Amino acid sequence: TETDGAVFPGRIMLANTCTWTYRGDECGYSGPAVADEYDQPTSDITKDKCSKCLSGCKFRNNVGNFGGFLSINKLSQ
Amino acid sequence: RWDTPKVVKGVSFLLRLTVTADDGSERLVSTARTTETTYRFTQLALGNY
Amino acid sequence: MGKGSSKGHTPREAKDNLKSTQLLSVIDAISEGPIEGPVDGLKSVLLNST
Amino acid sequence: LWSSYTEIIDVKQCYPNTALVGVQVDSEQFGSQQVSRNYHLRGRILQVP
Amino acid sequence: LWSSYTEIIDVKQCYPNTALVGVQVDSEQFGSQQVSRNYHLRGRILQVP
Amino acid sequence: GMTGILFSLGASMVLGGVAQMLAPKARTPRIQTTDNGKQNTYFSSLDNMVAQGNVLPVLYGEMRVGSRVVSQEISTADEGDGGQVVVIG
Ligand code: SF4
């Protein structure tokens, strides 16, 4: 139960990148392999990986479950 | 023109003007947030408001 | 004037047709214990650094 | 005509050992913002030999 | 006369597990400054015996 | 064999206080001169913050509080909420 080196609220809120796992119970993807570690098409289950960017979501046709708020300009403007 | 009521810190006066329509509804003509107690309106038409 | 309690005022200047003016009134606590008065008269009150 | 009359009672709570200043200003010639009050006072009465 | 028409697509990026409130106000009667939004919400649904 | 040097430490713990021996005590925040003389609360944020550095917060009951703004945008509105009642004059 030791709580060394841990922070309580474990969310980053927003970024250009997603902040979850792949094929978990929040991403909610169960389709065939389409993308790999980078933005390269593939069709093998062994090298199924998501770059956790917007391009990965566009590849997987699953954007409504994206964990990054697209603000960007709130810090500038 | 009016007077200043009991106040904490500081206040401003928000005043809006509405015009009774022909059917019976209301039409809002402008609005103003000011600090002076006295305000003046110019170039008003139609009837009751 | 100093001693323990003092009061002062300046002549109000307004008039020029019936109107209604505001009046801001505020109390300030300076320090504790028996203090002395201002180095000069009512001039020591500085509103907006004047 | 006579209008509403108001009976007002001031503060009966006195401050036993704290120095204080009360200032009232018409606050018309000032700006819409607040006004900073700075006072040029002397020091504290000490138990000097 | 007929002028330009605009086809608009809303956000498809749904928020998975975060509570959110979207507020649209005409913001005419408000001042040149921003507006602060407060929400008197309840708590979070917990697992209770 | 023997296990010497027990070195009882009951006295040393009380040196920091006794109420702390049963309660860890609530943490207190620091005071910023710039934020006048107001005292910051550790469990409420009335002001509405910016969605970036601040982590996604959590609510536990009541507390009309602010938020973390994600998108603010001002445009030109439409004349008419809906239906066929679309009068202008
Ligand atoms: S990015 Fe889109 S796809 Fe890749 S994990 Fe986050 S949600 Fe699932």
Closest CA to D27 of B37, F37, F62: B37
What residues have CB less than 8 Å from A75, skipping those under 6 apart? F50, F52
Q: Is A42 helix (H, G, I), strand (E, B) or coil?
A: coil
Q: Half-sphere exposure of F33 toward its Cβ, with a 13 Å CA cutoff?
A: 0
Per the CB < 8 Å rule, is F70 touching A9? no
Strand partners, D20: C29
Q: Is B13 helix (H, G, I), strand (E, B) or coil?
A: strand
| Ligand 1, pocket-test mutation among A29, A30, A55, A70, most atoms within 8 A of CB | A29
| Quoted resolution (Å) | 3.4
The DSSP secondary structure of A14-40, one letter per residue, reads --SB--S-SSSTTT---S---B-SSS-
Task: Name residue E28's amino acid.
Answer: E
D39 neighbors C39 (Cβ within 8 angstroms): no
d(CA A16, CA F70): 13
Q: Is the backbone of residue B9 left (phi > 0), alpha (psi -120 to 50) or beta?
A: left
Q: Is A75 helix (H, G, I), strand (E, B) or coil?
A: helix
> What technique solved it?
cryo-EM
Interface residue C21 vs chain D (CB under 8 A): yes
Residue burial F57-76, b: 16+ Cβ < 10 Å; e: rest: eeeeeebebbbbebeeeeee
d(CA E41, CA F45): 13
Closest CA to E34 of F50, B8, A57: F50
A52 neighbors A18 (Cβ within 8 angstroms): yes
What residues have CB less than 8 Å from F51, skipping those under 6 apart? A13, A14, A69, A71, A74, F68, F69, F70
User: Rounded to an integer, what is the distance from CA F74 to the centroid of its chain?
Assistant: 29
d(CA A7, CA F38): 27
d(CA D37, CA C45): 7
**What are B's interface residues with C at a Cβ cutoff of 8 A?**
1-4, 37-38
Q: Tell me whether strands D18-25 and C24-32 are parallel, antiparallel or unpaired.
A: antiparallel
* Burial class of A52 by CB neighbour count within 10 A (0 to 12, 13 to 18, 19+): buried
DSSP secondary structure letter of residue F14:
H
Strand partners, C45: D39
A54 neighbors A16 (Cβ within 8 angstroms): yes
- Dihedral, CA of residue A15, residue E39, residue E35 and residue D26, to nearest 10: -140
Ligand 1 atom showing the smallest separation from residue A28 Cα: 8
d(CA A4, CA F24): 17
d(CA C9, CA D25): 10
